[PDB]
């Protein structure tokens, strides 16, 4: 409906050529915004990682798992090839921490986003140092809109990287590997 997210580049109006609303309630629109925000944030983290690792970056100094024979620089510079070179213990640790965090996010917000609440406001994991602890209500909406726009652009970015890795010469700026 009205919500956040809209602004310039569309005319101040909602963008949905295929309908995908008018079959949605407040609960369904809240799910839409929660999924959009989670996908947006994950995609921003994903582009900030793949871009840093593949292009340049000093990489983390150290060893990564003193027992198995792996080095931070031995993982490589490719995105998908280095992910497979991450040990199974590290992969399971990452997935388990993410699962624990999201299960607690589902069970920790008592006005649930599907039962009231605000979509995308997950407990913890945001500013521990309180950078946005003094921002005005008017300025915070601008930052939320900027988050949404940067997240959509990053969604397109991760899918561009995935397309360039899987089917070569797609996304013409991205190289063949």
């Amino acid at each position: 409906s009205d919500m956040e997210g809209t602004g310039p580049e569309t005319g101040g109006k909602v963008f949905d050529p295929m309908g995908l609303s008018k079959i949605a309630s407040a609960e369904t629109l809240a799910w839409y915004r929660a999924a959009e925000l989670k996908h947006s944030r994950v995609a921003m983290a994903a582009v900030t990682g793949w871009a840093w690792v593949s292009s340049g970056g000093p990489l983390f100094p150290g060893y990564l798992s003193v027992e198995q024979g792996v080095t931070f620089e031995s993982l490589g510079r490719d995105g998908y090839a280095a992910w497979a070179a991450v040990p199974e213990a590290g992969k399971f640790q990452i997935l388990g921490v993410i699962g624990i965090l999201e299960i607690l996010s589902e069970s920790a917000v008592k006005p649930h986003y599907m039962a009231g609440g605000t979509p995308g406001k997950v407990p913890l994991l945001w500013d521990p140092l309180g950078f946005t602890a003094k921002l005005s209500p008017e300025t915070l909406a601008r930052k939320r809109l900027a988050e949404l726009k940067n997240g959509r652009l990053a969604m397109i970015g991760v899918m561009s990287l995935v397309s360039a890795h899987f089917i070569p010469n797609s996304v013409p700026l991205l190289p063949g590997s």
Partner: protein, 228 residues
Amino acid sequence: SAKADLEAFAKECNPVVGYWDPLGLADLPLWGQDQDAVIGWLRHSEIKHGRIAMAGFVGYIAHANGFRFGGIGPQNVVPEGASAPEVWDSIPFLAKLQIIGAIGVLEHISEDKNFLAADGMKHYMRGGKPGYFPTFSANVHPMPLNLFDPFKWSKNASPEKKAKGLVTETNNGRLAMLGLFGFLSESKIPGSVPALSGIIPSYDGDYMQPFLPTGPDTSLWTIGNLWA
């Protein structure tokens, strides 16, 4: 209050530029510590950085030209002509330790509440004057003369002259920051600044590590040198 004072101070620093805060640092709560304390901390950091940059610029010139104090002291170990980054490479390691320790003593005196309430003034993060160094009427043994005005040349100037002096101090500090890091950038990457290309030689060590090239353990002491 503090923000308006920042606007005014930025106006008298440069009326053409004025208040130039692109990265909004005058609005971040650092330690959840209000606005005025953050402003005081930022101003104190700027003034301290500027003073250290000015002193470092003059010291860099003195070291690169060759300006040894005399005999017997720690200048005896440093070779005649080594460029400024290498005079903090051949002084004794204990000399570096005691220099940094005395700098820390001065920092502690600068923020000690007992040294600061002896002059009747408060912390810069608690409503004080940023960059103010206190007197020495709290030590335990009397100091001959203070740090800010070692002689009594000051203290008769008008407050307006003091404000103009503070503005000149801040501007000269920023310019000295730029100059000293021009020196350090030429000492690492060639052709960074155009004017100093070929003047300052290249350095290999780390500029942020005080004791990675540890100096010698040479005990420059005679008469009663019972500590070996």
